[PDB]
Amino acid sequence: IDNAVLPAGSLVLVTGANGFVGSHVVEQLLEHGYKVRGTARSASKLANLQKRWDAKYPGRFETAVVEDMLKDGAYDEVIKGAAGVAHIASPVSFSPKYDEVVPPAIGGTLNALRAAAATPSVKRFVLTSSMMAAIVPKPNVPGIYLDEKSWNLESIDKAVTLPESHKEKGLWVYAASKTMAEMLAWHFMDENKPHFTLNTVLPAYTIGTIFDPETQSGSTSGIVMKLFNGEVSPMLALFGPQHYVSAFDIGLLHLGCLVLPQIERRRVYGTAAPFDWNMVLAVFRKLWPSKTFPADFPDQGQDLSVFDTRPSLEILKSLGREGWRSFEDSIKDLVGSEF
């Protein structure tokens, strides 16, 4: 990569490397010549991915353990030697228990930033936020435009005021955890003025290859894979209308945030285009014409939101892409094709 601000072969700390998005961020860092120390809550959580990366990128990936992101100094040992940090770990269980989701989301973010601020080698930091840190869209509302000043303050209300029993409690607790963790990351930069540059990535519903189906749920792509196998996840209905994005493109957006000089202090939307669950089923039938799939769901509208993707497309074009990877190619990365 020309003009890369982290020299070739530099070490990047990636937190939550056993997770779905984290494994794609690790993959693209390794693919572009960087060494990676990936954290997980246990060595066994990364065992299969370590075997994959040892075979594909020999001697470039290393496992590191961080069991609790809330303990003080959680990342103080794993940060040593790193030129960049990608903080991707956060609770995505959709648990309705506020105290189980919001404190690790905020605590992990701030412990990672504090470790980076105390480590002179760290020059760049990328935080995985979410499109939900800006908005949880409603069906068919024209004229909504989201940009780097958009914040989901509605989620702060709903995460605390909805009863624990509400069917959407977990979704709103999750959105508030992302909103507050990202707000506090930018405030940390303003207050402490550390010697590294921050960028954030805000993915939409991420679709792509599950590298290790044996010990990776696959998050959003695991829900899609369950539907491919005829299982309607209870979590599927706990989602409103929205945009998709390729997991491969999300890997590239984090890489660009870590190494491109023209991307500084940005909130990078990973939002390719709207989609619905009947478009997913239509692509399954096209890719696997012999297979039986669930019947179409009722029409659940469309997300008409428009995002300021200028830095997102600047990153993809600087890293050799023509634009966003298509919805059909993103689903094919996950479920393949019959022929």
Q: Which residues on neighbouring strands pair with residue 125, listed in sequence order?
A: 85, 198
160 binds, among K ion, a copy of itself, ligand NAP, none (CB under 5 to 8 A by kind): a copy of itself
Q: Does 92 bind a copy of itself (CB under 8 A)?
A: no
Within 251-290, the residues that bind a copy of itself by CB under 8 A are: none
Q: Does 104 bind ligand NAP (CB under 6 A)?
A: yes
Check if the beta carbon of residue 179 is closer than 8 Å to that of residue 136.
no
Q: Does 203 bind ligand NAP (CB under 6 A)?
A: yes
Q: Does 90 bind ligand NAP (CB under 6 A)?
A: yes
Q: Does 218 bind K ion (CB under 5 A)?
A: no
**Contact map string, positions 30 to 59, toward ligand NAP, x by CB under 6 A:** ----------xx---x--------------
Tell me, letter by letter, the H, E, C secondary structure of 87-110: ECCCCCCCCCCHHHHHHHHHHHHH
Q: What are the DSSP E strand ranges found in the chain?
A: 11-15, 35-40, 61-65, 84-87, 124-128, 145-146, 197-203, 205-207, 242-246, 267-270, 273-275, 306-307
Within 265-324, the residues that bind ligand NAP by CB under 6 A are: none
Choose which of 11, 15, 19, 27 interacts with K ion (CB under 5 A).
27
Choose which of 14, 112, 117, 180 interacts with a copy of itself (CB under 8 A).
180
Residues in contact with 88: Cβ distance below 8 Å, sequence separation at least 6, in sequence order: 14, 15, 16, 17, 19, 21, 22, 25, 128, 254
330 binds, among a copy of itself, ligand NAP, K ion, none (CB under 5 to 8 A by kind): none
Residues in contact with 283: Cβ distance below 8 Å, sequence separation at least 6, in sequence order: 327, 328, 331, 332
Choose which of 251, 256, 274, 311 interacts with K ion (CB under 5 A).
251
By beta-carbon proximity to K ion, the closer residue of 249 and 303 is: 249
Check if the beta carbon of residue 245 is closer than 8 Å to that of residue 271.
yes
Q: Which amino acid is at 55?
A: A
User: Given the rule CB under 8 A, which residues bind a copy of itself?
Assistant: 70, 98-99, 102-103, 106-107, 110, 153-154, 156-157, 160-161, 180, 183-184, 187, 191
